[PDB]
A paper describes a structure:
Human MHC class I proteins, or human leukocyte antigens (HLA-I), bind peptides, mostly eight to 14 residues long, for presentation on the cell surface for recognition by cytotoxic immune cells. HLA-I proteins are composed of a polymorphic, integral-membrane heavy- or α-chain (α1, α2 and α3 ectodomains) and an invariant light chain, β2-microglobulin (β2m). In order to coordinate α/β chain co-expression and incorporate specific peptides during secretion from eukaryotic cells, a linked “single-chain trimer” (SCT) construct, coupling all three components into a single polypeptide, has been widely used. Success was ultimately achieved by isolating and recombinantly expressing the VHH domain from a novel, high-affinity, anti-β2m camelid antibody, allowing the crystallization of all SCTs tested.
Canonical presentation was observed for the 9-mer peptides, with residues p2 and p9 occupying the primary anchors in the B- and F-pockets, respectively, regardless of the SCT design background (YML 9-mers shown in canonical “binding mode 1”). While the H74L mutation was only moderately stabilizing, the effect was sufficient to rescue expression of the relatively weakly-binding HLA-A*02:01–RMFPNAPYL SCT(23), which could not be expressed as a simple Y84A SCT but could be produced as a pHLA-IRF.
Numbering used by the authors:
A (entry chain B): 3 to 42, 45 to 117
B (entry chain A): 1 to 12, 25 to 121, 144 to 335, 340 to 417
């Protein structure tokens, strides 16, 4: 029903930066919270944002990562600054419907040298 | 009141959480209520729990202090005040090391004891170990300490313990601060004895207390340790000998036998523990010496399911049993963990899948201290 298109990953040098983007396909009434988890077995919260703009960040990325939203296109952005080798992971975009159904993207590999 | 010291242990299995989402009182539109997410049976203790409303996180969510059961698995209650309306949908999201992705569960709209529980979790690189201590009389928490909190004091968590003077709180704060430093060492000697890396997170759990009968006389005493959710060393029922699990715990056992640690605990568990339990039972008699019988009812929903409910009861000890034709049916039955309502009472239910038409052949049996006779429920 809902598809999440991810982009912006790849390789980057330490201290460098990347911008992820995630676009939800379907109705604008179909998705509230959007954000990212990253693979560790478990996947850890990176950042997410509600339709109204309420943000939350994982402790390990606070101050360096910033999530933003273009509600006119149901698309979110993740500005990841000051990247470290420990930030290397697959970053999964995700979304929550207004009935608390979760949708997951296939993820984008991020590698910091 | 706590045992004065924490003896050094001396130098020389993960479980996924069970999740229940429920309201404190029966859901009613326009009526203020409390939305609960109870997580239990999980190890290790690090866990991330969110309450969701219409696809986003509820901002002001509180949670109980970290505690654990007899099997060392942890439990936490996450809750928030809310007014459920017709369109709003609620859920609970739980993340844990045992989960490949965060799990979402939607909200489908006279014996006594004193117990102290201690949890110490190492955080390599992310600061000093997290130390959480809680004290219980029966199923009512009355004290707490959190090493990350601002007060750095032992704090009251029940109305009847606020009576105690400054000497009590200063003494319990002094003891629990030393216990934190002791277990910080303990994590180091255990990491060394087991030849473990400095980058891994590990957990020390400690529990001790005493039981008294309805005559308030000593029945049993306990004092046991656990490392990473597994038995390490435990004081036997005689309060004189130790049970060590492996070579590392045997070294601790010999150091505690030479220091006569068991004799110190025996005098506390039979004396101080009993004495102050009776003082707490007396001071909080309006709360601790009450018994709330479970308000019970039955729900029905080729095959059909029968659900036997028990609500707003105290204490938490209860037994719900299914049987067809007077024969205990321990098959095709679902039994959830007893959960706190958040107001001091507890909830539980029992399910059984019955072939449709044979519903009256099943009976639910309810055993509780507040019931004069055990009840029998049937559709």
């Amino acid at each position: 029903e809902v598809k999440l298109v991810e982009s912006g990953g790849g390789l980057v040098q330490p201290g460098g930066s990347l911008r992820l983007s995630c676009a939800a396909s379907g109705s604008i009434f179909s998705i509230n919270t959007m954000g990212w988890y990253r693979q560790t077995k478990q996947r850890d919260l990176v950042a997410d944002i509600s339709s109204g703009g309420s943000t939350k960040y994982g402790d390990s990325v606070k101050g360096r990562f910033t999530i933003s939203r273009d509600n006119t296109k149901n698309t979110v952005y993740l500005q990841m600054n000051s990247l470290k080798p420990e930030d290397t992971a697959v970053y999964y975009c995700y979304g929550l419907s207004y009935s608390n159904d979760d949708y997951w993207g296939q993820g984008t590999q991020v590698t910091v040298s | 009141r706590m045992f004065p010291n924490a003896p050094y242990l001396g130098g020389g299995i993960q479980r996924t959480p069970k999740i229940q989402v429920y309201s404190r009182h029966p859901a009613e539109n326009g009526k203020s209520n409390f939305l609960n997410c109870y997580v239990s049976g999980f190890h290790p203790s690090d866990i991330e729990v969110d309450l969701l409303k219409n696809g986003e996180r509820i901002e002001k969510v509180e949670h109980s202090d970290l505690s654990f059961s007899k099997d060392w698995s942890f439990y936490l209650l996450y809750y928030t005040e809310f007014t459920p309306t017709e369109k709003d949908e609620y859920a609970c999201r739980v993340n844990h090391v045992t989960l490949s992705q965060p799990k979402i569960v939607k909200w489908d709209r006279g014996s006594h004891s004193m117990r102290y529980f201690f949890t110490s979790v190492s955080r390599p690189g992310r600061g000093e170990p997290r130390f959480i201590a809680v004290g219980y009389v029966d199923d009512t928490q009355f004290v707490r300490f959190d090493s990350d909190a601002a007060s750095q004091r032992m704090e009251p968590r029940a109305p009847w313990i606020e009576q105690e003077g400054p000497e009590y709180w200063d003494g319990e704060t002094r003891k629990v601060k030393a216990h934190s430093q002791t277990h910080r060492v303990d994590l180091g000697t255990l990491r060394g004895c087991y030849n473990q890396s400095e980058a891994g997170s590990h957990t020390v759990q400690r529990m001790y207390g005493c039981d008294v009968g309805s005559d308030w006389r000593f029945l049993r005493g306990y004092h046991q340790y656990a490392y990473d959710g597994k038995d390490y060393i435990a004081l036997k029922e005689d309060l004189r000998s130790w049970t060590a699990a492996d070579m590392c715990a045997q070294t601790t056992k010999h150091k505690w036998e030479a220091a006569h640690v068991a004799e110190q605990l025996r005098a506390y568990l039979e004396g101080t523990c009993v004495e102050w339990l009776r003082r707490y039972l007396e001071n909080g008699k309006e709360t601790l010496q009450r018994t709330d019988a479970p308000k019970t009812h039955m729900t029905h929903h080729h095959e059909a399911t029968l659900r036997c409910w028990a609500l707003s009861f105290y204490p938490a000890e209860i037994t719900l049993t299914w049987q067809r034709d007077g024969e205990d049916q321990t098959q095709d039955t679902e039994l959830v963990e007893t959960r706190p309502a958040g107001d001091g009472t507890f909830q539980k239910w029992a399910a059984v899948v019955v072939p449709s038409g044979q519903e009256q052949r099943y009976t639910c049996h309810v055993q509780h201290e507040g019931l004069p006779k055990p009840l029998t429920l049937r559709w």
